Design a protein around this ligand. Sequence first.
Ligand SMILES: OC[C@H]1O[C@H](O)[C@@H](O)[C@@H](O)[C@@H]1O
Ligand SMILES: OC[C@H]1O[C@H](O)[C@@H](O)[C@@H](O)[C@@H]1O
Ligand SMILES: OC[C@H]1O[C@H](O)[C@@H](O)[C@@H](O)[C@@H]1O
Ligand SMILES: OC[C@H]1O[C@H](O)[C@@H](O)[C@@H](O)[C@@H]1O
Ligand SMILES: [Cl-]
Length: 414
Amino acid sequence: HMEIQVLKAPRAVVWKDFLGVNAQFLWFSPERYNKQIDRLQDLGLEWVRLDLHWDRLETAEDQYQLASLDQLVKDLEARQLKSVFYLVGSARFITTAPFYSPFQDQYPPRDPEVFARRMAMLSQRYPSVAAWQVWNEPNLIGFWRPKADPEGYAKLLQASTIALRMVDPEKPVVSAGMAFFSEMPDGRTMFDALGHLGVESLGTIATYHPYTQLPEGNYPWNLDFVSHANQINRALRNAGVPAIWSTEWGWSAYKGPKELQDIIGVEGQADYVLRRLALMSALDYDRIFLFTLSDLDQRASVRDRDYGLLDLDANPKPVYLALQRFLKVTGPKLRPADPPVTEDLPDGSFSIGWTREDGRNVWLFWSARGGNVRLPKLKEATLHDPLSGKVTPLSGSDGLEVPVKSSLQMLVWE
Ligand SMILES: OC[C@H]1O[C@H](O)[C@@H](O)[C@@H](O)[C@@H]1O
Ligand SMILES: OC[C@H]1O[C@H](O)[C@@H](O)[C@@H](O)[C@@H]1O
Ligand SMILES: OC[C@H]1O[C@H](O)[C@@H](O)[C@@H](O)[C@@H]1O
Ligand SMILES: OC[C@H]1O[C@H](O)[C@@H](O)[C@@H](O)[C@@H]1O
Ligand SMILES: [Cl-]
């Protein structure tokens, strides 16, 4: 046997349009988040996704805390960023939580119309915001207690969608990012259940958060990320969604102790993010958002502190430097293409071809078992390792010898 996963994107990818980042700007001073934005702009990116928690913005009924958010929205416009905000959680006055429950905000609102009016208020207050997203991961108990409720979420989404379109009928409404591939504890998927409730008629953007242990799946013997993504993306297109985003994905560089995610460190983070980026940019997403722009302080859980492209001082981590090298090699826009002709590409390889703006071909490739591959048609090419920054001219009188790594490499050829 011999199995290779080849991907070819369905359309051209323009990184500025396609690749955004999650951010947690309200956690930081304007001085600090403006530095983060400097680093983001240096990558040639402009899309950001920010979280709003209702119980932090409205601390009692009609008592708001918006000074920081007001300033942030002005600063985001001043930096020419394109933003999507999601609102999640119940304010204390409207929550369905039992009086004694420790997780008051993790319950949905008693009245979806009250939530909807808040989203409308925010949208009218901040017309520069590019898109509004309704709740977050409702297929997870931590965001919708005491148990997943597709009917309940559909009613919330419908009410919010109506209110948001009253404010601006042309602005996109984004449904909640579903955790993983939208699976619920009962064995159903939220996307399927919402489909039966006719939610696709609302015309909201569909999004999910396909975190996996490895870039290409959860186990080395079951690398089925591409299979799952293709399956859910096809179903969503079939349902007639206006667009598909992935509003969260990524890995933490935390040193532990282990909580869900294996310890991989700053170098593992760089490796995994680049491989996953190579996969998702060749799948049928209209936009994706890396989680996340910056490391966070002790207000975040141990794992959640280290997903950043940047450390707490807003300085590059290895994943940033790797992504920066990667995007410099690709240039700003990639058009779908085929990989070069190969001889003895190793079993397990991933293989993705593109052409960049100057017409040169770009081949993205890796394999868990490493090894070597021969390219019989080529006499010269340039090999890039975005993790080390090593650049190697390759040459041959009648074909190239190319080393294969477990990490992504980029071959630029003609
Ligand atoms: O709670 C974490 C952190 O994120 C929120 O968006 C803001 O309300 C901050 O003031 C808060 O400290
Ligand atoms: O907010 C990011 C959050 O995403 C999902 O809910 C999970 O994969 C967690 O692994 C992760 O921390
Ligand atoms: O099977 C792969 C997996 O197995 C072990 O538990 C650990 O070594 C992990 O770091 C590794 O990724
Ligand atoms: O937890 C992540 C955090 O750890 C330490 O505090 C420092 O190295 C920071 O720069 C880094 O962002
Ligand atoms: Cl170019």
